[PDB]
Design an enzyme around this catalytic site. Structure first.
Site, PDB file in Angstrom:
ATOM      1  N   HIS A  95       0.817  -1.206   0.000  1.00 12.16           N
ATOM      2  CA  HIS A  95       0.000   0.000   0.000  1.00 12.16           C
ATOM      3  C   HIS A  95       0.851   1.257   0.000  1.00 12.16           C
ATOM      4  CE1 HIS A  95       0.256   2.151   3.864  1.00 12.16           C
ATOM      5  NE2 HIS A  95       0.423   0.984   4.463  1.00 12.16           N
ATOM      6  N   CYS A  96       0.295   2.333  -0.552  1.00  8.32           N
ATOM      7  CA  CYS A  96       0.953   3.636  -0.569  1.00  8.32           C
ATOM      8  C   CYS A  96      -0.123   4.567  -0.027  1.00  8.32           C
ATOM      9  CB  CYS A  96       1.411   4.048  -1.990  1.00  8.32           C
ATOM     10  SG  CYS A  96       0.215   3.957  -3.371  1.00  8.32           S
ATOM     11  N   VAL A  97      -0.307   5.739  -0.624  1.00  8.74           N
ATOM     12  CA  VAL A  97      -1.350   6.646  -0.143  1.00  8.74           C
ATOM     13  C   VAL A  97      -2.685   6.310  -0.812  1.00  8.74           C
ATOM     14  CG1 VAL A  97      -2.156   9.048  -0.063  1.00  8.74           C
ATOM     15  CG2 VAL A  97       0.237   8.510   0.453  1.00  8.74           C
ATOM     16  N   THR A 103       1.876   1.763  -5.543  1.00 12.67           N
ATOM     17  CA  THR A 103       1.449   0.402  -5.273  1.00 12.67           C
ATOM     18  C   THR A 103       1.332  -0.351  -6.584  1.00 12.67           C
ATOM     19  OG1 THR A 103       0.225   0.960  -3.246  1.00 12.67           O
ATOM     20  CG2 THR A 103      -0.412  -1.051  -4.369  1.00 12.67           C
TER      21      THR A 103
END
Length: 161
Positions: A95-97, A103
């Protein structure tokens, strides 16, 4: 949260609450590759280390490998990311933002290395479950490079005694 390969690897954005993290767990998530930078994590969790302890407290093993928005991992980070992702095959979450650009790039890279997919198939694969995956040119360039260096990456990832 979405799966690219049913219960083996998927992606998502930054969780807002602990209940959202428990949702991951119910989905089959067991390990989490955290890609946003400290400040991004802090926007929802106040402190990066506090966020990581929350993941650990909920039975998920986290690994933080900070990648700047729109960017890609350095070659050294990619080695770490892939050694981590390949160490256990079940329930990997990246996950990222937003779970789209960064991602999506890591997910496509995973497919390229593990399935030998050509860069375009890998991108379409991820976009089919996550529209917009792989946002920047830098991320797209990176993926073609991964396909080109596939054999070298695998060799370095598995360098052992």
């Amino acid at each position: 949260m979405y799966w690219v390969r049913r219960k083996t690897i998927g992606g998502s954005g930054l969780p807002y609450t602990e209940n959202e993290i428990l949702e991951w767990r119910k989905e089959g998530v067991k390990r989490v590759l955290v890609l946003p930078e400290d400040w991004e994590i802090e926007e929802s969790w106040g402190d990066k280390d506090y966020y990581l302890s929350i993941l650990k407290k909920n039975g998920l093993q986290p690994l933080h490998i900070p990648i700047p928005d729109g960017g890609v991992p350095s070659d050294s980070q990619f080695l770490t990311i892939m050694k981590w992702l390949l160490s256990e095959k079940e329930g990997n979450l990246v996950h990222c933002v937003g779970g789209i650009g960064r991602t999506g790039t890591i997910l496509a890279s995973y497919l390229i290395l593990t399935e030998g997919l050509e860069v375009e198939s890998a991108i379409d694969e991820v976009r089919l479950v996550r529209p917009g995956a792989v946002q920047t040119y830098e991320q797209e360039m990176f993926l073609l490079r991964v396909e080109g260096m596939r054999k070298s990456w695998l060799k370095n990832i598995y360098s052992n005694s």
